[PDB]
Scaffold this motif. Structure first.
Motif, PDB file in Angstrom:
ATOM      1  N   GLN A  48      -3.529  15.763  -6.245  1.00  0.00           N
ATOM      2  CA  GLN A  48      -2.154  16.018  -5.866  1.00  0.00           C
ATOM      3  C   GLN A  48      -1.369  14.707  -5.832  1.00  0.00           C
ATOM      4  O   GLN A  48      -1.936  13.633  -5.588  1.00  0.00           O
ATOM      5  N   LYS A  49      -0.064  14.802  -6.061  1.00  0.00           N
ATOM      6  CA  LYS A  49       0.776  13.632  -6.002  1.00  0.00           C
ATOM      7  C   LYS A  49       2.218  14.041  -5.780  1.00  0.00           C
ATOM      8  O   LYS A  49       2.567  15.205  -5.911  1.00  0.00           O
ATOM      9  N   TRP A  50       3.040  13.082  -5.418  1.00  0.00           N
ATOM     10  CA  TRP A  50       4.451  13.352  -5.272  1.00  0.00           C
ATOM     11  C   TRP A  50       5.215  12.081  -5.199  1.00  0.00           C
ATOM     12  O   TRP A  50       4.686  11.054  -4.770  1.00  0.00           O
ATOM     13  N   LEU A  82       6.761   7.294  -3.294  1.00  0.00           N
ATOM     14  CA  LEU A  82       5.668   8.154  -3.721  1.00  0.00           C
ATOM     15  C   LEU A  82       4.408   7.933  -2.881  1.00  0.00           C
ATOM     16  O   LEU A  82       4.455   7.361  -1.798  1.00  0.00           O
ATOM     17  N   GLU A 121      -0.190   7.449  -3.329  1.00  0.00           N
ATOM     18  CA  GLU A 121      -1.340   7.378  -4.194  1.00  0.00           C
ATOM     19  C   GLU A 121      -1.794   8.731  -4.551  1.00  0.00           C
ATOM     20  O   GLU A 121      -1.670   9.657  -3.741  1.00  0.00           O
ATOM     21  N   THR A 122      -2.316   8.907  -5.753  1.00  0.00           N
ATOM     22  CA  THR A 122      -2.879  10.203  -6.112  1.00  0.00           C
ATOM     23  C   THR A 122      -4.067  10.563  -5.226  1.00  0.00           C
ATOM     24  O   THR A 122      -4.947   9.748  -5.096  1.00  0.00           O
ATOM     25  N   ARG A 123      -4.104  11.775  -4.642  1.00  0.00           N
ATOM     26  CA  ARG A 123      -5.192  12.210  -3.735  1.00  0.00           C
ATOM     27  C   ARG A 123      -5.979  13.449  -4.157  1.00  0.00           C
ATOM     28  O   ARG A 123      -5.555  14.177  -5.036  1.00  0.00           O
TER      29      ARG A 123
END
Lengths: 276, 98, 9
Positions: free
Chosen positions: A242-244, A230, A232-234
């Motif tokens: 956004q995240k993944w 994954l 870090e959340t950005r």
């Protein structure tokens, strides 16, 4: 129902000029709402969210003077810390501060915060009791004592229980339709061709707010932490995040792989698989 | 005594060739707050680059978000090059549309 | 409202 306010203050000294740069940033429910920057041409706290433009000139003059006061405070402190750690001249140094309050959904004070850091490192903090201090460094003990013997804790305690709460209320009222939002996650999955007979599955979460979110890939057995990759959340830059997170899957054996998205402004966790 | 920066390079909207978009270079977890951030197109420095103001996290580390207008093509590659006291050399990370 | 410090360091 839970709310909060924070002011993150910073002062940096460089080999540079004769004086520190002091920046103050205020947040209500985790979103910037005011800001002061001693580097500006006309150093003043400026509104940072539209709802704040309500406060008249008296408000900004006052906060501005508070700021100048703090700047002085950080300057003297930077000076003293230098002596406490026996650091000579010609270095860069940082002094940072976080302070504020947290209210529960009932708008009652849950906890106050007031901690300081030097060179990015914890220097001294006010315990949740709002009466005792924590300071690990031997150098910090000097400050601990000084502050103990001078009643500092009572002073910050008052602010935390009073103004910090009272103003946050006023702020929350003046910003009900602005900051009462949660931008729900819109998730999708992408397929990516990998090592022969293996494909990468990417679960995307876009345009959500606030930042906190969690993603998991249940092979739908019940569990996968199997080198799930994954990020870090950005910031998307538009106010949303956004995240993944992805996972390596057998090409073909790939529907029995589900992604879960827990985010708060969401009825129920989101559940998805692959879809042409 | 520094914390070395973490970089992420990604677009604001899902990339599509020919379509205008924005490219971000999110630099987090670093200290001290002094940092040089550059964004690159095919190796050259992109002229107009926005930079958010210095901010720090509840754990005392600083972060900055850099961004710029850009139009992805199949062929152009983009990257972000950060320079910071914690690293002997500048770190470059390339944008991966996926 | 911003906090205002007491004793310096």
């Amino acid at each position: 129902g839970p709310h909060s306010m924070r002011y993150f203050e910073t002062a940096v000294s460089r080999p540079g000029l004769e004086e520190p740069r002091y920046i103050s940033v205020g947040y209500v429910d985790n979103k910037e709402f005011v800001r002061f920057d001693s580097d500006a041409e006309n150093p003043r706290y400026e509104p940072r969210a539209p709802w704040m433009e309500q406060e008249g000139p008296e408000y900004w003059e006052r906060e501005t003077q508070k700021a100048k006061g703090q700047e002085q405070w950080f300057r003297v402190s930077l000076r003293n810390l230098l002596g406490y750690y026996n650091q000579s001249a010609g270095g860069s140094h940082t002094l940072q501060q976080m302070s504020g309050c947290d209210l529960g959904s009932d708008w009652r004070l849950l906890r106050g915060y007031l901690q300081f850091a030097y060179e990015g490192r914890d220097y001294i903090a006010l315990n949740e009791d709002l009466k005792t201090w924590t300071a690990a460094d031997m150098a910090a003990q000097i400050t601990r004592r000084k502050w103990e013997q001078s009643g500092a804790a009572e002073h910050y305690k008052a602010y935390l229980e009073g103004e910090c709460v009272e103003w946050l209320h006023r702020y929350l009222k003046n910003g009900n339709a602005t900051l009462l939002r949660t931008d729900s996650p819109k998730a999708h999955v992408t397929h990516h061709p990998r090592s022969k007979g293996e494909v990468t599955l990417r679960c995307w979460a876009l345009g959500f707010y606030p930042a906190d979110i969690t993603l998991t890939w249940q092979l739908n057995g019940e569990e996968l932490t199997q080198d799930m990759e994954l990020v870090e959340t950005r910031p998307a830059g538009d106010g949303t995040f956004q995240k993944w997170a992805s996972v390596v899957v057998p090409l073909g054996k790939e529907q029995n792989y589900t992604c879960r998205v827990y985010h708060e402004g969401l009825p129920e966790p989101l559940t998805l698989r692959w879809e042409p | 005594i520094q914390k070395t920066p973490q970089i992420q390079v990604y677009s604001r909207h899902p990339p599509e060739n020919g379509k205008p978009n924005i490219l971000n270079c999110y630099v987090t977890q670093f200290h001290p707050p002094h940092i040089e951030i550059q964004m690159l197109k095919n190796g050259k420095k992109i002229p107009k680059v926005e930079m958010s103001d210095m901010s720090f996290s509840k754990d005392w580390s600083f972060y900055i978000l850099a961004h710029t207008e850009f139009t992805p093509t199949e062929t152009d590659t983009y990257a972000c090059r950060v320079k910071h006291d914690s690293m002997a050399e500048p770190k470059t990370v390339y944008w991966d549309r996926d | 409202k911003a906090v205002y410090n007491f004793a310096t360091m």
